[PDB]
PDB file of C-alpha atoms in Angstrom:
ATOM      1  CA  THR A   1      16.050   2.995 -24.439  1.00 58.18           C
ATOM      2  CA  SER A   2      16.440   0.598 -21.479  1.00 58.13           C
ATOM      3  CA  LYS A   3      13.217   2.125 -20.060  1.00 57.51           C
ATOM      4  CA  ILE A   4      10.251  -0.278 -19.762  1.00 56.03           C
ATOM      5  CA  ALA A   5       6.799   1.115 -18.863  1.00 59.45           C
ATOM      6  CA  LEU A   6       5.105  -1.004 -16.187  1.00 58.04           C
ATOM      7  CA  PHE A   7       2.263   1.401 -15.423  1.00 60.11           C
ATOM      8  CA  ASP A   8       0.902   4.578 -16.985  1.00 60.30           C
ATOM      9  CA  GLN A   9      -2.548   5.599 -15.774  1.00 61.32           C
ATOM     10  CA  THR A  10      -4.620   8.565 -14.558  1.00 59.97           C
ATOM     11  CA  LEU A  11      -5.679   8.103 -10.918  1.00 54.40           C
ATOM     12  CA  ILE A  12      -7.817  10.034  -8.488  1.00 56.06           C
ATOM     13  CA  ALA A  13      -5.689  11.313  -5.623  1.00 55.45           C
ATOM     14  CA  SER A  14      -6.100  13.707  -2.767  1.00 54.60           C
ATOM     15  CA  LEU A  15      -3.676  16.602  -3.161  1.00 56.88           C
ATOM     16  CA  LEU A  16      -2.717  18.153   0.199  1.00 58.37           C
ATOM     17  CA  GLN A  17      -0.679  21.233   0.751  1.00 55.01           C
ATOM     18  CA  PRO A  18      -0.044  23.790   3.502  1.00 53.72           C
ATOM     19  CA  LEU A  19      -2.077  27.029   3.231  1.00 54.03           C
ATOM     20  CA  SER A  20       1.294  28.886   3.065  1.00 53.46           C
ATOM     21  CA  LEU A  21       4.938  28.808   4.237  1.00 54.15           C
ATOM     22  CA  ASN A  22       3.756  30.108   7.645  1.00 54.75           C
ATOM     23  CA  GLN A  23       0.471  28.149   7.883  1.00 51.57           C
ATOM     24  CA  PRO A  24       1.134  24.384   7.969  1.00 53.84           C
ATOM     25  CA  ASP A  25      -2.593  23.501   8.081  1.00 53.13           C
ATOM     26  CA  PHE A  26      -3.477  21.620   4.898  1.00 51.72           C
ATOM     27  CA  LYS A  27      -6.020  22.332   2.153  1.00 54.26           C
ATOM     28  CA  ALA A  28      -7.139  19.155   0.361  1.00 52.67           C
ATOM     29  CA  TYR A  29      -8.639  18.551  -3.066  1.00 53.38           C
ATOM     30  CA  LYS A  30      -9.502  15.483  -5.138  1.00 54.87           C
ATOM     31  CA  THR A  31      -7.410  15.767  -8.324  1.00 54.36           C
ATOM     32  CA  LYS A  32      -6.645  13.546 -11.329  1.00 55.07           C
ATOM     33  CA  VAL A  33      -2.926  12.685 -11.447  1.00 53.90           C
ATOM     34  CA  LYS A  34      -0.969  10.678 -14.009  1.00 55.70           C
ATOM     35  CA  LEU A  35       1.210   8.045 -12.420  1.00 54.87           C
ATOM     36  CA  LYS A  36       3.988   6.408 -14.415  1.00 59.68           C
ATOM     37  CA  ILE A  37       5.989   3.414 -13.081  1.00 60.40           C
ATOM     38  CA  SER A  38       8.842   2.116 -15.175  1.00 58.30           C
ATOM     39  CA  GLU A  39      11.999  -0.009 -14.858  1.00 56.39           C
ATOM     40  CA  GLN A  40      15.336   1.099 -16.335  1.00 59.17           C
ATOM     41  CA  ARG A  41      19.058   0.444 -16.258  1.00 61.00           C
ATOM     42  CA  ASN A  42      21.295   2.919 -14.364  1.00 60.17           C
ATOM     43  CA  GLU A  43      23.744   4.225 -17.008  1.00 61.47           C
ATOM     44  CA  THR A  44      26.810   4.317 -14.758  1.00 63.50           C
ATOM     45  CA  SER A  45      26.238   1.065 -12.815  1.00 64.73           C
ATOM     46  CA  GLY A  46      24.011  -1.044 -15.117  1.00 62.94           C
ATOM     47  CA  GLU A  47      21.792  -1.947 -12.133  1.00 62.77           C
ATOM     48  CA  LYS A  48      17.975  -2.088 -12.248  1.00 60.57           C
ATOM     49  CA  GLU A  49      16.086   1.051 -11.256  1.00 61.58           C
ATOM     50  CA  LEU A  50      12.444   1.596 -10.550  1.00 60.13           C
ATOM     51  CA  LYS A  51      11.168   5.037 -11.527  1.00 58.72           C
ATOM     52  CA  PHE A  52       8.003   6.726 -10.148  1.00 57.51           C
ATOM     53  CA  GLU A  53       6.744   9.841 -12.010  1.00 55.32           C
ATOM     54  CA  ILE A  54       3.723  11.997 -11.159  1.00 56.74           C
ATOM     55  CA  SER A  55       2.291  14.722 -13.405  1.00 56.27           C
ATOM     56  CA  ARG A  56      -1.039  16.446 -14.242  1.00 56.87           C
ATOM     57  CA  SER A  57      -2.537  17.141 -17.698  1.00 61.34           C
ATOM     58  CA  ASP A  58      -3.686  20.659 -16.749  1.00 59.85           C
ATOM     59  CA  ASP A  59      -0.595  21.689 -14.652  1.00 60.68           C
ATOM     60  CA  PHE A  60       2.638  21.310 -16.660  1.00 57.64           C
ATOM     61  CA  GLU A  61       4.540  22.828 -13.700  1.00 55.47           C
ATOM     62  CA  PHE A  62       3.470  19.741 -11.623  1.00 53.28           C
ATOM     63  CA  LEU A  63       6.325  17.263 -12.199  1.00 52.03           C
ATOM     64  CA  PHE A  64       7.710  14.958  -9.533  1.00 58.25           C
ATOM     65  CA  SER A  65       9.811  11.756  -9.691  1.00 56.45           C
ATOM     66  CA  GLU A  66      11.949   9.335  -7.720  1.00 55.13           C
ATOM     67  CA  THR A  67      14.212   6.491  -8.919  1.00 53.84           C
ATOM     68  CA  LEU A  68      14.698   3.586  -6.580  1.00 53.50           C
ATOM     69  CA  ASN A  69      17.537   1.067  -6.791  1.00 50.60           C
ATOM     70  CA  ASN A  70      17.609  -2.078  -4.582  1.00 53.18           C
ATOM     71  CA  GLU A  71      19.453  -0.210  -1.745  1.00 50.65           C
ATOM     72  CA  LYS A  72      16.990   2.711  -1.735  1.00 51.68           C
ATOM     73  CA  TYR A  73      14.131   0.189  -1.814  1.00 53.58           C
ATOM     74  CA  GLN A  74      15.484  -1.650   1.259  1.00 53.10           C
ATOM     75  CA  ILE A  75      15.224   1.639   3.202  1.00 53.81           C
ATOM     76  CA  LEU A  76      11.593   2.034   2.018  1.00 52.16           C
ATOM     77  CA  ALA A  77      10.777  -1.628   2.857  1.00 51.86           C
ATOM     78  CA  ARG A  78      12.338  -1.132   6.306  1.00 55.36           C
ATOM     79  CA  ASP A  79      10.413   2.071   7.036  1.00 53.78           C
ATOM     80  CA  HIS A  80       7.035   0.531   6.011  1.00 51.37           C
ATOM     81  CA  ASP A  81       7.502  -3.137   6.983  1.00 50.96           C
ATOM     82  CA  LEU A  82       7.237  -4.349   3.400  1.00 54.83           C
ATOM     83  CA  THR A  83       7.966  -8.082   2.978  1.00 56.88           C
ATOM     84  CA  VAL A  84       7.918  -8.120  -0.849  1.00 58.77           C
ATOM     85  CA  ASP A  85      11.356  -7.993  -2.593  1.00 59.79           C
ATOM     86  CA  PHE A  86      12.452  -5.207  -4.933  1.00 58.91           C
ATOM     87  CA  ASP A  87      11.533  -7.163  -8.094  1.00 59.35           C
ATOM     88  CA  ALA A  88       8.058  -8.156  -6.837  1.00 57.43           C
ATOM     89  CA  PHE A  89       7.202  -4.696  -5.342  1.00 55.03           C
ATOM     90  CA  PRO A  90       5.931  -3.015  -8.570  1.00 57.37           C
ATOM     91  CA  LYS A  91       3.931  -6.082  -9.639  1.00 58.60           C
ATOM     92  CA  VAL A  92       2.005  -6.256  -6.349  1.00 57.90           C
ATOM     93  CA  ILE A  93       1.044  -2.572  -6.130  1.00 57.15           C
ATOM     94  CA  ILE A  94       0.127  -2.575  -9.837  1.00 54.44           C
ATOM     95  CA  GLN A  95      -1.931  -5.755  -9.645  1.00 54.75           C
ATOM     96  CA  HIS A  96      -3.536  -5.291  -6.232  1.00 51.00           C
ATOM     97  CA  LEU A  97      -3.832  -1.613  -5.545  1.00 50.79           C
ATOM     98  CA  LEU A  98      -3.396   0.749  -8.471  1.00 51.95           C
ATOM     99  CA  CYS A  99      -5.517  -1.041 -11.160  1.00 55.30           C
ATOM    100  CA  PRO A 100     -10.492   0.252  -0.877  1.00 54.21           C
ATOM    101  CA  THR A 101      -7.512   2.196  -2.271  1.00 58.32           C
ATOM    102  CA  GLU A 102      -6.757   5.847  -1.482  1.00 55.80           C
ATOM    103  CA  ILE A 103      -3.893   7.903  -2.805  1.00 60.63           C
ATOM    104  CA  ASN A 104      -2.557  10.974  -1.014  1.00 62.09           C
ATOM    105  CA  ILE A 105      -0.083  13.424  -2.477  1.00 63.41           C
ATOM    106  CA  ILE A 106       1.372  15.825   0.052  1.00 62.87           C
ATOM    107  CA  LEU A 107       3.147  18.894  -1.319  1.00 63.80           C
ATOM    108  CA  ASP A 108       5.994  20.811   0.216  1.00 66.31           C
ATOM    109  CA  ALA A 109       5.080  24.484   0.900  1.00 65.09           C
ATOM    110  CA  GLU A 110       7.849  25.407  -1.627  1.00 64.91           C
ATOM    111  CA  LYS A 111       6.774  22.567  -4.018  1.00 65.84           C
ATOM    112  CA  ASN A 112      10.319  21.084  -4.053  1.00 63.84           C
ATOM    113  CA  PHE A 113       9.045  17.720  -3.020  1.00 65.43           C
ATOM    114  CA  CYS A 114       5.889  15.748  -2.611  1.00 68.41           C
ATOM    115  CA  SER A 115       5.100  12.598  -0.595  1.00 66.20           C
ATOM    116  CA  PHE A 116       3.257   9.982  -2.659  1.00 65.54           C
ATOM    117  CA  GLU A 117       1.219   7.781  -0.211  1.00 65.65           C
ATOM    118  CA  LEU A 118      -0.802   4.618  -0.888  1.00 65.51           C
ATOM    119  CA  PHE A 119      -3.501   3.162   1.384  1.00 64.91           C
ATOM    120  CA  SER A 120      -5.678   0.057   1.543  1.00 63.75           C
ATOM    121  CA  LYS A 121      -8.299   0.502   4.309  1.00 62.93           C
ATOM    122  CA  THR A 122      -8.813  -2.238   6.909  1.00 69.22           C
ATOM    123  CA  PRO A 123     -11.651  -2.468   9.462  1.00 68.56           C
ATOM    124  CA  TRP A 124      -9.142  -1.188  12.142  1.00 70.41           C
ATOM    125  CA  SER A 125      -6.758   1.179  10.267  1.00 71.06           C
ATOM    126  CA  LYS A 126      -6.029   3.479   7.305  1.00 69.33           C
ATOM    127  CA  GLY A 127      -3.830   0.668   5.970  1.00 71.12           C
ATOM    128  CA  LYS A 128      -0.859   2.707   4.743  1.00 69.29           C
ATOM    129  CA  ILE A 129       1.163   0.601   2.277  1.00 67.23           C
ATOM    130  CA  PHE A 130       4.071   3.095   1.792  1.00 66.31           C
ATOM    131  CA  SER A 131       5.032   6.720   1.110  1.00 65.66           C
ATOM    132  CA  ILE A 132       7.685   7.793  -1.392  1.00 63.99           C
ATOM    133  CA  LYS A 133       9.305  11.216  -1.340  1.00 63.52           C
ATOM    134  CA  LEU A 134       9.271  12.438  -4.947  1.00 63.75           C
ATOM    135  CA  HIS A 135      11.358  15.424  -5.986  1.00 64.41           C
ATOM    136  CA  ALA A 136      10.484  18.284  -8.352  1.00 66.31           C
ATOM    137  CA  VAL A 137      11.730  17.611 -11.906  1.00 66.76           C
ATOM    138  CA  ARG A 138      14.012  20.633 -12.148  1.00 66.67           C
TER     139      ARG A 138
ATOM    140  CA  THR B   1     -19.343  -9.160  38.971  1.00 69.78           C
ATOM    141  CA  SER B   2     -18.969  -6.231  36.537  1.00 67.72           C
ATOM    142  CA  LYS B   3     -16.864  -8.558  34.332  1.00 67.94           C
ATOM    143  CA  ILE B   4     -18.375  -9.418  30.912  1.00 71.16           C
ATOM    144  CA  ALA B   5     -16.715 -12.092  28.718  1.00 73.65           C
ATOM    145  CA  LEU B   6     -16.410 -10.958  25.092  1.00 72.93           C
ATOM    146  CA  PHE B   7     -14.076 -13.753  23.920  1.00 70.22           C
ATOM    147  CA  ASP B   8     -12.823 -17.043  25.327  1.00 69.72           C
ATOM    148  CA  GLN B   9     -11.187 -19.358  22.794  1.00 68.08           C
ATOM    149  CA  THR B  10      -8.165 -21.634  22.261  1.00 67.89           C
ATOM    150  CA  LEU B  11      -5.986 -20.304  19.425  1.00 68.08           C
ATOM    151  CA  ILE B  12      -2.866 -21.455  17.656  1.00 73.88           C
ATOM    152  CA  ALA B  13       0.010 -19.076  18.337  1.00 71.90           C
ATOM    153  CA  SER B  14       3.724 -19.001  17.753  1.00 70.80           C
ATOM    154  CA  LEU B  15       5.520 -18.813  21.060  1.00 68.14           C
ATOM    155  CA  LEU B  16       8.913 -17.124  20.710  1.00 67.83           C
ATOM    156  CA  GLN B  17      11.537 -16.768  23.342  1.00 67.21           C
ATOM    157  CA  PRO B  18      15.262 -15.981  23.583  1.00 66.73           C
ATOM    158  CA  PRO B  19      20.525 -14.813  22.526  1.00 66.61           C
ATOM    159  CA  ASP B  20      18.373 -15.458  19.367  1.00 64.48           C
ATOM    160  CA  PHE B  21      14.763 -16.812  19.433  1.00 64.84           C
ATOM    161  CA  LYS B  22      13.394 -20.400  19.456  1.00 61.70           C
ATOM    162  CA  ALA B  23       9.835 -20.737  18.114  1.00 61.54           C
ATOM    163  CA  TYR B  24       7.090 -23.282  18.613  1.00 61.06           C
ATOM    164  CA  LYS B  25       3.454 -23.505  17.487  1.00 63.13           C
ATOM    165  CA  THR B  26       1.431 -23.776  20.730  1.00 58.06           C
ATOM    166  CA  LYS B  27      -2.254 -23.738  21.681  1.00 59.70           C
ATOM    167  CA  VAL B  28      -3.066 -20.762  23.925  1.00 59.55           C
ATOM    168  CA  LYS B  29      -6.317 -19.689  25.573  1.00 60.32           C
ATOM    169  CA  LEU B  30      -7.180 -16.072  24.974  1.00 55.44           C
ATOM    170  CA  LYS B  31      -9.780 -14.326  27.124  1.00 58.17           C
ATOM    171  CA  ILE B  32     -11.070 -10.820  26.310  1.00 57.45           C
ATOM    172  CA  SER B  33     -13.486  -9.208  28.729  1.00 58.64           C
ATOM    173  CA  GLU B  34     -14.857  -5.772  29.723  1.00 61.22           C
ATOM    174  CA  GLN B  35     -15.076  -4.649  33.366  1.00 62.30           C
ATOM    175  CA  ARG B  36     -15.520  -1.617  35.600  1.00 62.44           C
ATOM    176  CA  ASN B  37     -12.415  -0.208  37.350  1.00 61.33           C
ATOM    177  CA  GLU B  38     -13.286  -0.399  41.078  1.00 61.37           C
ATOM    178  CA  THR B  39     -11.690   2.904  42.079  1.00 61.41           C
ATOM    179  CA  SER B  40     -12.701   5.029  39.048  1.00 64.87           C
ATOM    180  CA  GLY B  41     -15.822   3.262  37.680  1.00 63.66           C
ATOM    181  CA  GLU B  42     -14.467   3.595  34.134  1.00 64.21           C
ATOM    182  CA  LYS B  43     -14.643   0.832  31.480  1.00 64.64           C
ATOM    183  CA  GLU B  44     -11.666  -1.479  31.188  1.00 62.17           C
ATOM    184  CA  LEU B  45     -10.760  -3.988  28.546  1.00 65.16           C
ATOM    185  CA  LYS B  46      -8.892  -7.021  29.901  1.00 64.34           C
ATOM    186  CA  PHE B  47      -6.705  -9.399  27.850  1.00 60.37           C
ATOM    187  CA  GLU B  48      -5.678 -12.697  29.497  1.00 58.40           C
ATOM    188  CA  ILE B  49      -3.451 -15.427  28.011  1.00 56.92           C
ATOM    189  CA  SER B  50      -3.010 -18.903  29.520  1.00 56.83           C
ATOM    190  CA  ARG B  51      -2.186 -22.523  28.538  1.00 55.52           C
ATOM    191  CA  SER B  52      -3.942 -25.727  29.684  1.00 55.06           C
ATOM    192  CA  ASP B  53      -0.694 -27.674  30.168  1.00 51.90           C
ATOM    193  CA  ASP B  54       1.410 -24.802  31.692  1.00 53.10           C
ATOM    194  CA  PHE B  55      -0.300 -23.366  34.798  1.00 48.18           C
ATOM    195  CA  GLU B  56       2.729 -21.080  35.306  1.00 48.90           C
ATOM    196  CA  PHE B  57       1.913 -19.414  31.917  1.00 51.93           C
ATOM    197  CA  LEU B  58      -0.371 -16.523  32.964  1.00 52.32           C
ATOM    198  CA  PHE B  59      -0.257 -13.071  31.428  1.00 49.56           C
ATOM    199  CA  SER B  60      -2.747 -10.203  31.409  1.00 49.93           C
ATOM    200  CA  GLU B  61      -3.169  -6.526  30.609  1.00 54.89           C
ATOM    201  CA  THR B  62      -6.087  -4.190  31.382  1.00 55.61           C
ATOM    202  CA  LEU B  63      -6.618  -1.297  29.016  1.00 55.37           C
ATOM    203  CA  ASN B  64      -8.617   1.832  29.837  1.00 58.22           C
ATOM    204  CA  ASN B  65      -9.424   4.494  27.178  1.00 57.10           C
ATOM    205  CA  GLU B  66      -6.123   6.383  27.898  1.00 59.78           C
ATOM    206  CA  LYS B  67      -3.970   3.235  27.597  1.00 60.28           C
ATOM    207  CA  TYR B  68      -5.867   2.341  24.425  1.00 58.02           C
ATOM    208  CA  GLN B  69      -5.117   5.740  22.846  1.00 57.23           C
ATOM    209  CA  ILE B  70      -1.383   5.004  23.270  1.00 59.37           C
ATOM    210  CA  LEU B  71      -1.892   1.606  21.560  1.00 62.50           C
ATOM    211  CA  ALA B  72      -3.969   3.159  18.726  1.00 64.42           C
ATOM    212  CA  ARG B  73      -1.271   5.806  18.250  1.00 67.17           C
ATOM    213  CA  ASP B  74       1.586   3.274  18.151  1.00 65.07           C
ATOM    214  CA  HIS B  75      -0.207   0.993  15.614  1.00 64.49           C
ATOM    215  CA  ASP B  76      -2.198   3.536  13.561  1.00 65.41           C
ATOM    216  CA  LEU B  77      -5.533   2.105  14.684  1.00 64.94           C
ATOM    217  CA  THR B  78      -8.587   4.088  13.493  1.00 64.85           C
ATOM    218  CA  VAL B  79     -11.215   2.134  15.475  1.00 62.77           C
ATOM    219  CA  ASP B  80     -12.331   3.692  18.820  1.00 60.27           C
ATOM    220  CA  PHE B  81     -11.913   2.026  22.217  1.00 60.09           C
ATOM    221  CA  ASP B  82     -15.498   0.657  22.267  1.00 56.91           C
ATOM    222  CA  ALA B  83     -15.330  -0.788  18.722  1.00 56.76           C
ATOM    223  CA  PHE B  84     -11.767  -2.221  19.091  1.00 57.00           C
ATOM    224  CA  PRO B  85     -12.720  -5.558  20.738  1.00 57.31           C
ATOM    225  CA  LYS B  86     -15.614  -6.185  18.334  1.00 56.59           C
ATOM    226  CA  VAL B  87     -13.426  -5.554  15.178  1.00 58.61           C
ATOM    227  CA  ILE B  88     -10.540  -7.869  16.255  1.00 55.76           C
ATOM    228  CA  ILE B  89     -13.003 -10.554  17.519  1.00 56.51           C
ATOM    229  CA  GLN B  90     -15.226 -10.484  14.424  1.00 59.79           C
ATOM    230  CA  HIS B  91     -12.588 -10.187  11.702  1.00 60.44           C
ATOM    231  CA  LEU B  92      -9.406 -11.706  12.991  1.00 59.97           C
ATOM    232  CA  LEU B  93      -9.947 -14.027  15.922  1.00 61.19           C
ATOM    233  CA  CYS B  94     -13.181 -15.578  14.434  1.00 65.14           C
ATOM    234  CA  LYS B  95     -11.124 -17.476  11.731  1.00 63.26           C
ATOM    235  CA  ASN B  96      -8.434 -18.794  14.196  1.00 64.60           C
ATOM    236  CA  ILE B  97     -10.879 -21.156  16.208  1.00 63.28           C
ATOM    237  CA  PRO B  98      -4.507 -14.813   6.904  1.00 63.70           C
ATOM    238  CA  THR B  99      -4.357 -14.435  10.714  1.00 65.73           C
ATOM    239  CA  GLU B 100      -1.215 -15.206  12.737  1.00 65.66           C
ATOM    240  CA  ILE B 101      -0.596 -14.749  16.424  1.00 70.34           C
ATOM    241  CA  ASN B 102       2.858 -14.294  17.956  1.00 71.12           C
ATOM    242  CA  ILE B 103       3.609 -14.419  21.649  1.00 71.42           C
ATOM    243  CA  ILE B 104       7.070 -13.148  22.469  1.00 74.73           C
ATOM    244  CA  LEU B 105       8.386 -13.972  25.914  1.00 77.15           C
ATOM    245  CA  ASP B 106      10.741 -12.064  28.116  1.00 74.85           C
ATOM    246  CA  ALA B 107      13.865 -14.116  28.879  1.00 75.35           C
ATOM    247  CA  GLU B 108      12.784 -13.961  32.590  1.00 73.68           C
ATOM    248  CA  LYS B 109       9.079 -14.577  31.659  1.00 75.59           C
ATOM    249  CA  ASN B 110       7.950 -11.377  33.472  1.00 76.00           C
ATOM    250  CA  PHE B 111       6.235 -10.120  30.354  1.00 82.64           C
ATOM    251  CA  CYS B 112       5.121 -11.231  26.947  1.00 86.38           C
ATOM    252  CA  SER B 113       4.200  -9.283  23.798  1.00 87.45           C
ATOM    253  CA  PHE B 114       0.907 -10.457  22.307  1.00 88.98           C
ATOM    254  CA  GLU B 115       1.005  -9.679  18.525  1.00 89.38           C
ATOM    255  CA  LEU B 116      -1.776 -10.056  15.936  1.00 88.84           C
ATOM    256  CA  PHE B 117      -1.172 -10.161  12.144  1.00 90.52           C
ATOM    257  CA  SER B 118      -3.276 -10.227   8.975  1.00 91.12           C
ATOM    258  CA  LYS B 119      -0.966 -10.911   5.985  1.00 90.01           C
ATOM    259  CA  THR B 120      -1.125  -8.675   2.910  1.00 89.88           C
ATOM    260  CA  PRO B 121       0.535  -9.306  -0.465  1.00 88.07           C
ATOM    261  CA  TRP B 122       3.255  -6.702   0.558  1.00 88.90           C
ATOM    262  CA  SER B 123       3.621  -7.063   4.359  1.00 87.59           C
ATOM    263  CA  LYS B 124       3.222  -9.189   7.528  1.00 85.67           C
ATOM    264  CA  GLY B 125       0.236  -6.960   8.296  1.00 84.38           C
ATOM    265  CA  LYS B 126       0.740  -6.319  11.982  1.00 86.52           C
ATOM    266  CA  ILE B 127      -2.556  -5.163  13.536  1.00 88.70           C
ATOM    267  CA  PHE B 128      -1.183  -4.476  17.059  1.00 86.16           C
ATOM    268  CA  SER B 129       0.987  -5.735  19.935  1.00 86.48           C
ATOM    269  CA  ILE B 130       0.080  -5.599  23.599  1.00 87.97           C
ATOM    270  CA  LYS B 131       2.589  -6.011  26.383  1.00 86.00           C
ATOM    271  CA  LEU B 132       1.008  -8.460  28.866  1.00 89.08           C
ATOM    272  CA  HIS B 133       2.486  -8.882  32.352  1.00 87.12           C
ATOM    273  CA  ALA B 134       2.959 -12.059  34.408  1.00 89.15           C
ATOM    274  CA  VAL B 135       0.074 -12.726  36.814  1.00 91.09           C
TER     275      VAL B 135
END
């Protein structure tokens, strides 16, 4: 309705997850993941929201999302030293990184949440852009 | 004697100092060298900052592998101790005669933070910061 799709593509990501509840060591696989980025209006406040949704074509049980408003974004920008404002944020990652880039998806052992992480390698670092905690769509 | 110069250039830096900061663009000489610690024999990386006009402006820090590991941990560096100087010299300090250098002074000028940046479309792009001490 108010929802505007900004990005909807299948990406190659590394999916990481603990071996079990008691074994925190990760197992890692390269998997194809659908990433959807959209903007929408919060129904109670009318303010702009940025929604991130991750799914898989094979695994219907794999559904994670997070909606960011300007306040939530400021926390993210603060934690990852982002300079870009809330409105410019989606445009930059879409035009410069999502279109060398690495995506990591780290699952909870209970699969209640997953950390969506984006990287742009430098000659001296992994070049982490940001990580977003996405929650299971339940 | 054991000292080997890896870098010796005049760079443009922003000198910041305190309650709030005042900032000026200043020319600073940066010297990077490798040397042998006299007591241990281990390799050391030395960073020295000076100015031609201000003789009182003298700051240095010597990093060994252990000290470097702390720096790499604090700034998510992937490059090893031996490759570190080459990477910064060849990719970031080569273009300075989107690289920016900040030098942040102590109010008492006992120490200064030497910070290196490579701007990205989403961030300032801090590479690292080294606390240098007054010589």
